Every structure is written in structure tokens, then in C-alpha cells.
């Protein structure tokens, strides 16, 4: 799977909000482009003159994520974050010259990402009460990954002492994206656990935080809620469910070639962090069949 790389695998089956610190600093921002940020302004002007209803929005930038020594007390993860925008993304990661910017960043800064917007995404492995994961079909008319399978998620917009409010907005945003797109009541959802961070090598290395969320509704009840919104209540064109039993071998199925990179990252992290048992009971051959 060359189109996805794991930047972080969380310990303990995944980290709760109270175990994560953020450092939000202009030191974590994108570097100005070698020939100046005028190249970004030119791309944006061209795009607005074709689609004048488009609007910019601020985004969090991922710089890096450092895990504490395993089994330690105190905070277990430090997220180093900067600020970026939808405009900066379109002028860098989604530029035809994104690979040239990666080579230039390695040369100038020893950092393939130094000249890239790298907005932070969020995604969920969302499990039902009857042990299925939730999948969504992307419209064939959108610019990114048209017609591919996705999981719930989005790119959160900004509004340890500004730190804790930023971690709160990251965890909040994955629940809000489930309520907005799947049409589920907030009180049916567990507090999220962070599973890890995956990079999309087809989008010049932009990263998504991948979370596990449990719903108290069955697959049948989730479907009813999604469909009862009607076609204008969701960006996706359909919903479907795979038993958690069968998610274990999803990379060996024909579904795998239809999954967008960030959904592949969610499923790899679910399998490594929530699946893959370590104890004698769940690891016994009848409960963990070989092959
Ligand atoms: C990585 C991001 S941030 C962002 N903000 C607003 N719209 C977007 N779309 C739908 C193109 C994006 C994408 C793909």
C-alpha cells in the first residue's frame, strides 16, 4: 500500500483526550515558498475567477507527533501543530508541482513537508452495537478520490494552555462529523480514542488523525438514521457495513482497491490497535483463527 504510511500507532488500544498534549506554535507553520507565496495567490485567483462562490477557511497543520516511552505515567502524546488554510492546500499539496516542493524542502530544510500546507484530517472507525464498521460511498462528481469508499471524517477548522482547547476541538470534531454526515444523535456515541496518524502519499503526504468510536445503535438503526436525512442531509451517495470479523482480512478483498487512502489508514490502525489481541484468551485458536 504505497499510497498510505503510518506516522503514529497509539499504545494501550488507543489514547483518550486526557492523555494528549498539543503545542500550537507559529514555529510549526509551513515555510514561505522559495520564489515567494505569490505562486499560491496566483492559483487561488485563477480558481475564484472560475468558481467565485468558493471561500477560504483556516485549518490545523500537523508538524510532528512524539509518543512518550510506553508504560509511563503522565501525558502519553505531544502533537506539534501550526496553522494553514484551504487556499494554501490548493497552492501546495494539490499543485501539479507538489513533488518538486517535497524535493526542495528536503534540500533546504531536511524536511520533505517544509513547503506543504499539510492540513490535519480526522477519520473514524465507527463500530455498531452488533459489531460492524460503517463505510460511505463518495460522489463520482467531487475533485478528491471520486467514487471511492470512505469512513466518516473531515478537516476541522480552528475556533498546554491553548493546547487543551485544541485537543478538545480535535476530539469534538470527529463526533460532529459523524452527527452531520451519518445523522446519528450525539448521545449514541462513545468518547473517541485516538488510534494513530496516517499519511496520504497521493496528496503529497498530508496526515489524518484516525479515531475509534462506538455507537449504541445496531447497523439497521444506523442505516435508518442516515437514509431518513434524505439526499441533501449527506455528501456521500450511500452507506454500508462490514462485520468486524471480516475487517481483519479487508486488504485481501476486492473492496481494498476502492478505499481512499485515509480510509485505508483508519482500517490498518483499527486492525493493529483495536484488533490483534495480546492475551491468552482472545489469542486462543478458536477466537483468533490462523491465516
Ligand atoms: C484537505 C482538504 S481541507 C479542505 N477544506 C475544504 N474543502 C476541501 N475539499 C472538499 C476539497 C478540503 C480538503 C480536501
Q: Give residue 197 CA to ligand 1 midpoint distance, Å.
A: 18
* CA separation for the pair 218, 123 (Å, rounded): 20
3-state secondary structure the chain: CCCEEEEEECCCCCECHHHEEEEECHHHCCCCCCCCCHHHHHHHHHHHCCCCCCCCCEEEEEEEEEECCCCCCCCCEEEEEEEEEHHHHHHCCCCCCHHHHHHHHHHHHCCCCCCCCCECEEEEEEECCCCEEEEEECCCCCCCCCCCEECCEECCCCCCCCHHHHHHHHHHHHHHHHHHHHCCCHHHECCCEEEEEEEEHHHCCEEEEEEEEEECCCHHHHHHHHHHCCHHHCCCCEEEEEEHHHHCCHHHCHHHHHECHHHHHHHHHHHHHHCCCCCHHHHCCCCCCCC
Pick from 268, 269, 188: nearest CA to 11: 269
* CA separation for the pair 165, 115 (Å, rounded): 27
Determine if ligand 1 sits within 6 Å of the CB of residue 143: yes
Give the contacts of 33 (CB within 8 A, at least 6 positions apart).
39, 40, 92, 101, 115
Q: Give residue 24 CA to ligand 1 midpoint distance, Å.
A: 21
Cell matching residue 219: 447497523
Determine if ligand 1 sits within 6 Å of the CB of residue 205: no
With contact defined as beta carbons under 8 Å apart, do 189 and 178 qualify?
yes
Pick from 16, 252, 246: nearest CA to 135: 246
CA 217 vs. chain centroid, Å, equals 23
Determine if ligand 1 sits within 6 Å of the CB of residue 60: no
With contact defined as beta carbons under 8 Å apart, do 149 and 121 qualify?
no
**Cβ neighbours, 10 Å, residue 69:** 6
With contact defined as beta carbons under 8 Å apart, do 81 and 28 qualify?
yes
CA 29 vs. chain centroid, Å, equals 19
CA 74 vs. chain centroid, Å, equals 25
Q: Give residue 92 CA to ligand 1 midpoint distance, Å.
A: 13
Q: Give residue 291 CA to ligand 1 midpoint distance, Å.
A: 39
Beta pairing partners, 8 = 197
* CA separation for the pair 41, 43 (Å, rounded): 6
Q: Which residue has the least CA distance to atom 7 on ligand 1?
A: 86
- Residue 55 is labelled as binding a ligand: yes
- Residue 181 is labelled as binding a ligand: yes
- Residue 177 is labelled as binding a ligand: yes
Q: Which residue has the least CA distance to atom 4 on ligand 1?
A: 86
With contact defined as beta carbons under 8 Å apart, do 30 and 207 qualify?
no
Cell matching residue 29: 507553520
Q: Give residue 220 CA to ligand 1 midpoint distance, Å.
A: 31
Q: Solving technique for this entry?
A: X-ray
With contact defined as beta carbons under 8 Å apart, do 194 and 10 qualify?
yes
- Residue 157 is labelled as binding a ligand: yes
Pick from 200, 180, 119, 183: nearest CA to 155: 119
In which region does residue 12 sit, left (phi positive, over 0), alpha (psi from -120 to 50) or beta (all else)?
left
With contact defined as beta carbons under 8 Å apart, do 35 and 92 qualify?
no
Q: Give residue 144 CA to ligand 1 midpoint distance, Å.
A: 8
User: Greatest CA separation found in the chain?
Assistant: 63
Determine if ligand 1 sits within 6 Å of the CB of residue 115: no
Give the contacts of 166 (CB within 8 A, at least 6 positions apart).
22, 24, 60, 79, 81, 158
- Residue 226 is labelled as binding a ligand: no
Amino acid at each position: 500500500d504505497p499510497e498510505v504510511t503510518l506516522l503514529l500507532q497509539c499504545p494501550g488500544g488507543g489514547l483518550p483526550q486526557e492523555q494528549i498534549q498539543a503545542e500550537l506554535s507559529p514555529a510549526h507553520d509551513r515555510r514561505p515558498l522559495p520564489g515567494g507565496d505569490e505562486a499560491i495567490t496566483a492559483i487561488w485567483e485563477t480558481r475564484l475567477k472560475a468558481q467565485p462562490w468558493l471561500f477560504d477557511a483556516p485549518k490545523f497543520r500537523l508538524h510532528s507527533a512524539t509518543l512518550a516511552p510506553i508504560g509511563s505515567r503522565g501525558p502519553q502524546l505531544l502533537l506539534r501543530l501550526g496553522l494553514t488554510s484551504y487556499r494554501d492546500f490548493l497552492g501546495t499539496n494539490w499543485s501539479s508541482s507538489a513533488a518538486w516542493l517535497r524535493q526542495q524542502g528536503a534540500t533546504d530544510w531536511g524536511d520533505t513537508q517544509a513547503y506543504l500546507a499539510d492540513p490535519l484530517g480526522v477519520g473514524a472507525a465507527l463500530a455498531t452495537a452488533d459489531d460492524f464498521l460503517v463505510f460511505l460511498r463518495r460522489s463520482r462528481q467531487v475533485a478528491e478520490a471520486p467514487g471511492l469508499v470512505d469512513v466518516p471524517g473531515g478537516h476541522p477548522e480552528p475556533q498546554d494552555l491553548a493546547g487543551q482547547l485544541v485537543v478538545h476541538e480535535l476530539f469534538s470534531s470527529v463526533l460532529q462529523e459523524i452527527c452531520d454526515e451519518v445523522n446519528l444523535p450525539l448521545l449514541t456515541l462513545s468518547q473517541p480514542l485516538l488510534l494513530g496518524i496516517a499519511r496520504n502519499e497521493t496528496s503529497a503526504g498530508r496526515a489524518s488523525a484516525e479515531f475509534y468510536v462506538q455507537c449504541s445503535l445496531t447497523s439497521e438503526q444506523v442505516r435508518k438514521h442516515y437514509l431518513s436525512g434524505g439526499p441533501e442531509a449527506h455528501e456521500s451517495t450511500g452507506i454500508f457495513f462490514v462485520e468486524t470479523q471480516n475487517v481483519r482480512r479487508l486488504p485481501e478483498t476486492e473492496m481494498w482497491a476502492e478505499l481512499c487512502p485515509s480510509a485505508k489508514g483508519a482500517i490498518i490502525l483499527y486492525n493493529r490497535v483495536q484488533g490483534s489481541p495480546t492475551g491468552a484468551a482472545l489469542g486462543s485458536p478458536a477466537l483468533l483463527p490462523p491465516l
